[PDB]
Amino acid sequence: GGANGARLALMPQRDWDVNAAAVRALPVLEKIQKESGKASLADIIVLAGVVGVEKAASAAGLSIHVPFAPGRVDARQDQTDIEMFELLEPIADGFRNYRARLDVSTTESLLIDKAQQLTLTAPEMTALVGGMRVLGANFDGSKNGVFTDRVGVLSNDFFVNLLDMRYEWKATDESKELFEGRDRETGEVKFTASRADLVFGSNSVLRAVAEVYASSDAHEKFVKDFVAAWVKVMNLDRFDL
Amino acid sequence: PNQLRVDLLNQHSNRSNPLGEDFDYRKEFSKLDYYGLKKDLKALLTESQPWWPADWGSYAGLFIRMAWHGAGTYRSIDGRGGAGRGQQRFAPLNSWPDNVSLDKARRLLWPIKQKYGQKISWADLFILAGNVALENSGFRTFGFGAGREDVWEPDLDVNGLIYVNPEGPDHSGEPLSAAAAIRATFGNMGMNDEETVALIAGGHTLGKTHGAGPTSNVGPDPEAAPIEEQGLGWASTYGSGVGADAITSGLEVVWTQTPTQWSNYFFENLFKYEWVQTRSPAGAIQFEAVDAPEIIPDPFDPSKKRKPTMLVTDLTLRFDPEFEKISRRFLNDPQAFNEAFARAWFKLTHRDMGPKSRYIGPEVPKEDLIWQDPLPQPIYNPTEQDIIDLKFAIADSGLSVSELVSVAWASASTFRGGDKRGGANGARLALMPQRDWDVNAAAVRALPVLEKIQKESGKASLADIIVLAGVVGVEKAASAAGLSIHVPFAPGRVDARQDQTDIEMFELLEPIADGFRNYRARLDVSTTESLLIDKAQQLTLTAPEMTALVGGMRVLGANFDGSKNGVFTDRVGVLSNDFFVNLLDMRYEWKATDESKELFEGRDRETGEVKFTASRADLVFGSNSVLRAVAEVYASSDAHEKFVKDFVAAWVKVMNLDRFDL
Amino acid sequence: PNQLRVDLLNQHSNRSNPLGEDFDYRKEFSKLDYYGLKKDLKALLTESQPWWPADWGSYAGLFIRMAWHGAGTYRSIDGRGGAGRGQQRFAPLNSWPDNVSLDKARRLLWPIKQKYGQKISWADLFILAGNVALENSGFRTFGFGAGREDVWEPDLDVLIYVNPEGPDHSGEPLSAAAAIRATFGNMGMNDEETVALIAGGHTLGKTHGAGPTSNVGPDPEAAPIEEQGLGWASTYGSGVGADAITSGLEVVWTQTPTQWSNYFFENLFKYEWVQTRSPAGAIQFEAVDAPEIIPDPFDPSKKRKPTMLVTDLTLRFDPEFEKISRRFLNDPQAFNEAFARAWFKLTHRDMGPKSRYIGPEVPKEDLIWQDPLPQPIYNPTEQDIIDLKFAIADSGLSVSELVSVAWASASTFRGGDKRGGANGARLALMPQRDWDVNAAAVRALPVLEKIQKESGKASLADIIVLAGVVGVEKAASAAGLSIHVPFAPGRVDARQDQTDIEMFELLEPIADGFRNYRARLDVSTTESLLIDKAQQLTLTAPEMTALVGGMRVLGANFDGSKNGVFTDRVGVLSNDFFVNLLDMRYEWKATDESKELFEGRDRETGEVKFTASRADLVFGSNSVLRAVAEVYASSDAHEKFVKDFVAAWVKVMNLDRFDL
Numbered sequence A: 001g002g003a004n005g006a007r008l009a010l011m012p013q014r015d016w017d018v019n020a021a022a023v024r025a026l027p028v029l030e031k032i033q034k035e036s037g038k039a040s041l042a043d044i045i046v047l048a049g050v051v052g053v054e055k056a057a058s059a060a061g062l063s064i065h066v067p068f069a070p071g072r073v074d075a076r077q078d079q080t081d082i083e084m085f086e087l088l089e090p091i092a093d094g095f096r097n098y099r100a101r102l103d104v105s106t107t108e109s110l111l112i113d114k115a116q117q118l119t120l121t122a123p124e125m126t127a128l129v130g131g132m133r134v135l136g137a138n139f140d141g142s143k144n145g146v147f148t149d150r151v152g153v154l155s156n157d158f159f160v161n162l163l164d165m166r167y168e169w170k171a172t173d174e175s176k177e178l179f180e181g182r183d184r185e186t187g188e189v190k191f192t193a194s195r196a197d198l199v200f201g202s203n204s205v206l207r208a209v210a211e212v213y214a215s216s217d218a219h220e221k222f223v224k225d226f227v228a229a230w231v232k233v234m235n236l237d238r239f240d241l
Numbered sequence B: 001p002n003q004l005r006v007d008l009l010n011q012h013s014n015r016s017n018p019l020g021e022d023f024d025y026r027k028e029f030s031k032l033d034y035y036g037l038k039k040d041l042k043a044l045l046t047e048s049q050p051w052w053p054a055d056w057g058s059y060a061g062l063f064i065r066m067a068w069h070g071a072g073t074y075r076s077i078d079g080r081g082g083a084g085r086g087q088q089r090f091a092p093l094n095s096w097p098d099n100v101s102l103d104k105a106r107r108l109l110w111p112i113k114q115k116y117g118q119k120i121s122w123a124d125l126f127i128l129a130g131n132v133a134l135e136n137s138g139f140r141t142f143g144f145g146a147g148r149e150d151v152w153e154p155d156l157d158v159n160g161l162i163y164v165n166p167e168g169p170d171h172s173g174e175p176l177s178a179a180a181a182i183r184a185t186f187g188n189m190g191m192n193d194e195e196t197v198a199l200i201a202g203g204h205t206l207g208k209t210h211g212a213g214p215t216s217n218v219g220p221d222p223e224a225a226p227i228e229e230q231g232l233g234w235a236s237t238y239g240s241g242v243g244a245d246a247i248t249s250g251l252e253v254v255w256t257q258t259p260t261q262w263s264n265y266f267f268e269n270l271f272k273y274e275w276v277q278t279r280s281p282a283g284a285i286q287f288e289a290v291d292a293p294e295i296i297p298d299p300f301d302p303s304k305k306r307k308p309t310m311l312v313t314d315l316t317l318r319f320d321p322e323f324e325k326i327s328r329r330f331l332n333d334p335q336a337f338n339e340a341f342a343r344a345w346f347k348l349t350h351r352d353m354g355p356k357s358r359y360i361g362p363e364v365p366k367e368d369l370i371w372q373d374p375l376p377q378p379i380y381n382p383t384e385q386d387i388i389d390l391k392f393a394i395a396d397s398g399l400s401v402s403e404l405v406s407v408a409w410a411s412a413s414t415f416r417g418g419d420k421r422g423g424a425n426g427a428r429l430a431l432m433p434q435r436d437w438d439v440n441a442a443a444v445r446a447l448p449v450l451e452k453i454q455k456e457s458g459k460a461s462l463a464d465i466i467v468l469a470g471v472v473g474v475e476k477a478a479s480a481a482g483l484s485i486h487v488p489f490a491p492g493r494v495d496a497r498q499d500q501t502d503i504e505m506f507e508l509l510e511p512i513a514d515g516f517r518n519y520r521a522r523l524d525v526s527t528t529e530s531l532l533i534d535k536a537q538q539l540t541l542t543a544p545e546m547t548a549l550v551g552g553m554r555v556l557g558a559n560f561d562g563s564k565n566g567v568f569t570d571r572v573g574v575l576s577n578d579f580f581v582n583l584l585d586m587r588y589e590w591k592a593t594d595e596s597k598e599l600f601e602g603r604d605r606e607t608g609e610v611k612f613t614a615s616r617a618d619l620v621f622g623s624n625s626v627l628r629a630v631a632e633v634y635a636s637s638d639a640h641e642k643f644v645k646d647f648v649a650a651w652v653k654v655m656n657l658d659r660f661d662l
Numbered sequence C: 001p002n003q004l005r006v007d008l009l010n011q012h013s014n015r016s017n018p019l020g021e022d023f024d025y026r027k028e029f030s031k032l033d034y035y036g037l038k039k040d041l042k043a044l045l046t047e048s049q050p051w052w053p054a055d056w057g058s059y060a061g062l063f064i065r066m067a068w069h070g071a072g073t074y075r076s077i078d079g080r081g082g083a084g085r086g087q088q089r090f091a092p093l094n095s096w097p098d099n100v101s102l103d104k105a106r107r108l109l110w111p112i113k114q115k116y117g118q119k120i121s122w123a124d125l126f127i128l129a130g131n132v133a134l135e136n137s138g139f140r141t142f143g144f145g146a147g148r149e150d151v152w153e154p155d156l157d158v159l160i161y162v163n164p165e166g167p168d169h170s171g172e173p174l175s176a177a178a179a180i181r182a183t184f185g186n187m188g189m190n191d192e193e194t195v196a197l198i199a200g201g202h203t204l205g206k207t208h209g210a211g212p213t214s215n216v217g218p219d220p221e222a223a224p225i226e227e228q229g230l231g232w233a234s235t236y237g238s239g240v241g242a243d244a245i246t247s248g249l250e251v252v253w254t255q256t257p258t259q260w261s262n263y264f265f266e267n268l269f270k271y272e273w274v275q276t277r278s279p280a281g282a283i284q285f286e287a288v289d290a291p292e293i294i295p296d297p298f299d300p301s302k303k304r305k306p307t308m309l310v311t312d313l314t315l316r317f318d319p320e321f322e323k324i325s326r327r328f329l330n331d332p333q334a335f336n337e338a339f340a341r342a343w344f345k346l347t348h349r350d351m352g353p354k355s356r357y358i359g360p361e362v363p364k365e366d367l368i369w370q371d372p373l374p375q376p377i378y379n380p381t382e383q384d385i386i387d388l389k390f391a392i393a394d395s396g397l398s399v400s401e402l403v404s405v406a407w408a409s410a411s412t413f414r415g416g417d418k419r420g421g422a423n424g425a426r427l428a429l430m431p432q433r434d435w436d437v438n439a440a441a442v443r444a445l446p447v448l449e450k451i452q453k454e455s456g457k458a459s460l461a462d463i464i465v466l467a468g469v470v471g472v473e474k475a476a477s478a479a480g481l482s483i484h485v486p487f488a489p490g491r492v493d494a495r496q497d498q499t500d501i502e503m504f505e506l507l508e509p510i511a512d513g514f515r516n517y518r519a520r521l522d523v524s525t526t527e528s529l530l531i532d533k534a535q536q537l538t539l540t541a542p543e544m545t546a547l548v549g550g551m552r553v554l555g556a557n558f559d560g561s562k563n564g565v566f567t568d569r570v571g572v573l574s575n576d577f578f579v580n581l582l583d584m585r586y587e588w589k590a591t592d593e594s595k596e597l598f599e600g601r602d603r604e605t606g607e608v609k610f611t612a613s614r615a616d617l618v619f620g621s622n623s624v625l626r627a628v629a630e631v632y633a634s635s636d637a638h639e640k641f642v643k644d645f646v647a648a649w650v651k652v653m654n655l656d657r658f659d660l
């Protein structure tokens, strides 16, 4: 797996359920790559994320440098065996609120399993979930777990809103993968979430990291931690480096 | 002869430090048995070494002199010299005519120094030796502050004597003419009339002067004698050469009759007895109390006495109408004398030490003084949200990248390295006289906004908000060039009062030139590029640091008066390497506009049209080869992120130079 | 006037580096598109800038001259100068009389340099520019090795060869022979190599002198700041192009002035010569009774008859050179062979061992002036080294002797041209075996050689450095301050067939302050010689101080005298040297007028307890040095002295480990 090769552009990943929205940014980048014949589409694809994160950090008054390692290459359809790559399709990607079937495991166990496959630590997984939530990186762009009003700015709003005893959370149906937050005083409904947003206030080891990021001295800290974890996940398949 | 001294910027590197680059003097000092060291020093005060016998069994008169000569090379105009760096141990100062026999004083200190190691530094040990010497004669001290950390190279600055000829001006034994000499020399050190009286009268109550025979008996200074002399100069063929034959100044004066006890006898004799003219054996003019008995015990022979005597320089006070009044003030009240002398002595030995946050140890006085440039305790404690909020506010104020950077630089760049004065702590940019200086005129136009942002937010001080404005400006300009970076910010500065900013001692901090903003005042003083070096040295920068900052400040448009001298770009306000690229590009030829060649036009060598202008401060970076060697690094094709990081690090270094509180 | 240049020791610190102290030149070079750079340089060779137009459209004769002038400041006696550090860019050399117009040659290189960055260094770029210039004219090169890493200060530790107009401006080619011979020999070139170099260097290009020399303005370090780094401006005509004045003469040697050929010798012998002068009134030699065949560099309708320099006719009229010159006259392939060998040499002579060469054109033939080393026939394991240490420990050599042999082998390294060091075991071969200073150390060789026969697991260079390791570890244990002394294995022993005695006799010390050896008493002062030795080792003043003191207590005196042995436990590593040196108990008197020996007596009893030389006693006379002495003599500095001495020792053991 990984970002080297630009398999997102070839089959079968172009056409996977979870990739559906992300794919709407492909034809622009491809064009930016014809006009510039100076990089490959794998490098331009990772650079797009670099620009997005730097913009969002500037919006929160916490500007940071996002490192970029160039030199990826684009592979050819002939080197991408669809049957071998169909095994790489996620049954669940908690980091973007995609779960496929409802008879395999729990959403939060699948979250752990995904994070392990990425060789992350528990802090790393916590920081990334929260960041991806404020940046609005939901597949299908729903507002599950978007605990903020400045969608696209990289703040600690997710942990602050998740932990503050203002809202009580109710489950909407017998499925129990969807919950509403309402204010424990007025009753109104301000947020929605899934089991992947809400394990971070139920498991005590995870909540112990949430609180670190939700505390008063953890703005620059959350930004640095998220940026380091992001760059680590950008570079996992760079064995050429 | 006519050479840039870029080699100023290389001094005090990793190569010459015999200790680590991790040695923390403060932490070593924490281990010092400070009062046990004072015990061993007072012990030494009377342990008489045969190669240099003690006068009246007491080296005290010797130590006070050595500490006073240390401190007395200070200059108020730039902050160089003084006793803050221990420099009296190295050449050239160790060998100047005025320090004959001070190598003995330094030599006699080596056993204490050796027992204690780096836990005290030579530069602290000297001043403390003088203090203990005073405290052991009956006199009481104002207090002492350690913290002078030692260095390992002799500072190449520009400087014979310390203040005046002891023998009247031009060796003409008239006390009258000596008055103006003393006045000028001591004033340029920052002392007024009364302080001069107290110092010269106190310094001359203890000890004596040495001159048994012809000076020709004395050998070469320490940096000129045979290698077997092992660091000691001024050997003497007269009699023993030492003891009662010691010859240093050449004159033989003893001022009191208890030459090892404090008293009020200097003034007493000064006015009581009249005086006649003679000369000590070495043919130098002397004044001796006339019609007096024998009262002064002789330093080595008991059964012998001498009638009071004086130096020409001792007789300006009491005669120059001005000084007489302070001197009789003190004659008829020695408690005033003691108080004034002690305050002046503390001052003299702590004037190039800087803000009270640099003082360490258990005798640091509690009274704040005006020559300390004092700062008040803080009434603010900004949180993290408060800072993000201030940054949104300043960003949304309408100041341009140019203006924001201008105010931050104008506030920080007053720091000197020599005596540790200036810097951004205190908000002196807002008070007199800096609000009204020529170079600050434009930067000042961003003050009334920030002050308002500071009323609305009562969460930080104006010094912190002033440095934060520059932080916002630099972060914006880095984002414009596609090279976004984090600009570090250290909060916790405090705003001072006009009551702590003596306009007279801050008018010495006014730049004659700030090459980093294209301001040069007068045209008779130096070259623009040597003034640039001098400014950078005062900031303790390296040549790369100075290069990166000049270029950055040029693209951000940080010119005072905001002219287009050296603005080699079209995107003014974005932080690119455009300055070095256009500067080195053989496309443009540069011509001088007039005979006062401080202005040049660039026209393209093809069409001939004029695209840029510059001054000598922009164009040394393509004429001096050491500087151009760094320019090319920044102008090369792999050096965009590099230039941004280097400029940001140098900026933050110049923001934090006066943060000794940290 | 009479100073101790301790200030030499401070150069090249963190403060003046604009690149950081992590920059690995080798690793940056790994990224270079080396052949694409060669393509861009070849492009440059013919792209003519209006402010210095190209002769015959070609800047090649300019770049060969720049590269040769770079390399030609070398000296064989110490290893200073040369082209290994890029120094031709800085003062003073950038402004010397003999480098006029090489500032424009360096300026024309800046676009390539800028496109490439730190991937190539100025000091490599120069030599490669000259190479490409040669390769584009028809001539073939021996090979090229990059690796010259750039520096940022002008080296304070110090007429490139001869005057073209005969010695003392007397236009007699005869007298110029001895001048050429001496000057080129100082560089380690023999007769044939000199002939080849001069004759080759003078086939491409020309000399410039349209008008009077007074039209030329001041050198780069004296000109107005608007000149932006270029000197020698000219009021004559255009001042540039066909009006260029640099040297001042007007000589063109061939008729295809941009193609390789054999015409230099051809016309040299194939014409008599008359004496004229170029327009600037300088002596020239003119091929007499000749036609018009030399194309004019900027007018395609004028011609000129061959011409020569006095220094070109020396290698013809002189009897000695005539024979090599005719050898080559009747054999131009021999000419190409010899010139190319000599040119590779001239540009790689201060580069050092083949392990310092990088890039894809490094020749494969080892040469003698490279000081070659063979491939290793040993790979010692960890037990093998513990075993050798038990063996050496149990041999019966004293701490003094062991330390003596290790130091005697390592201390030949110079920093300038990178020669010497402990790799190779030249201490065992000629001529170092029989050098004066080595006499005592040699008495520990026959033991180690035997330990090296019994064990066939390491080389004698490794066993020699290991002996010093054991000695220092023992001495630290004696002082109650036990420490680990690092060892890097993998040295190789060289063969007498690779140790040219003549070029290793240049490595003999006139003085080694660290073991109390001086040779002659009319060269310099003992303490300035000490500084000079320490600089050649690239040490800092603290490093030099710590090592002198340590070597004194370990008793590492050559001849094992007791000059400066300020202790009673000789062989234990204490700070006794600095403590006794500084303690005001003893007064020091000089024994005679040749004041290099002094007695210490007690200033109280008067008895004589120590002796010393000027090399022991500068450390209490110079104030910068005494400032470090006191650090080591102070009460909290026992472990500190041990660690500092051990680090400096290991640094001097590893100076020539460019293989690592």
Ligand code: HEM
Binding pocket: B055, B060, B061, B062, B064, B065, B068, B163, B164, B165, B166, B182, B199, B200, B202, B203, B204, B206, B207, B208, B209, B210, B211, B247, B248, B249, B250, B251, B313
């Ligand atoms: C107008 C300013 C001054 C002049 C002209 C002056 C002159 C002299 C001279 C000529 C000596 C004799 C040196 C020798 O032969 O050993 C001396 C000694 C001495 N000076 Fe001053 N001095 C001045 C200021 C001061 C100050 C400001 C202090 C202390 C704050 C001071 C402290 C001493 C002491 C204690 C001695 C006695 C030296 C001994 O016992 O060996 N002097 N002075």
Ligand code: HEM
Binding pocket: C055, C060, C061, C062, C064, C065, C068, C101, C161, C162, C163, C164, C180, C197, C198, C200, C201, C202, C204, C205, C206, C207, C208, C209, C245, C246, C247, C248, C249, C311
């Ligand atoms: C006896 C030794 C030498 C003498 C006396 C000498 C002298 C000269 C002089 C006077 C010039 C004219 C410079 C000018 O006006 O531009 C010149 C040019 C030149 N030198 Fe030499 N040189 C010597 C050795 C060498 C060597 C060893 C080389 C190369 C290996 C060399 C390569 C060149 C070249 C290529 C030029 C042509 C310059 C051009 O085209 O601008 N020279 N030489």
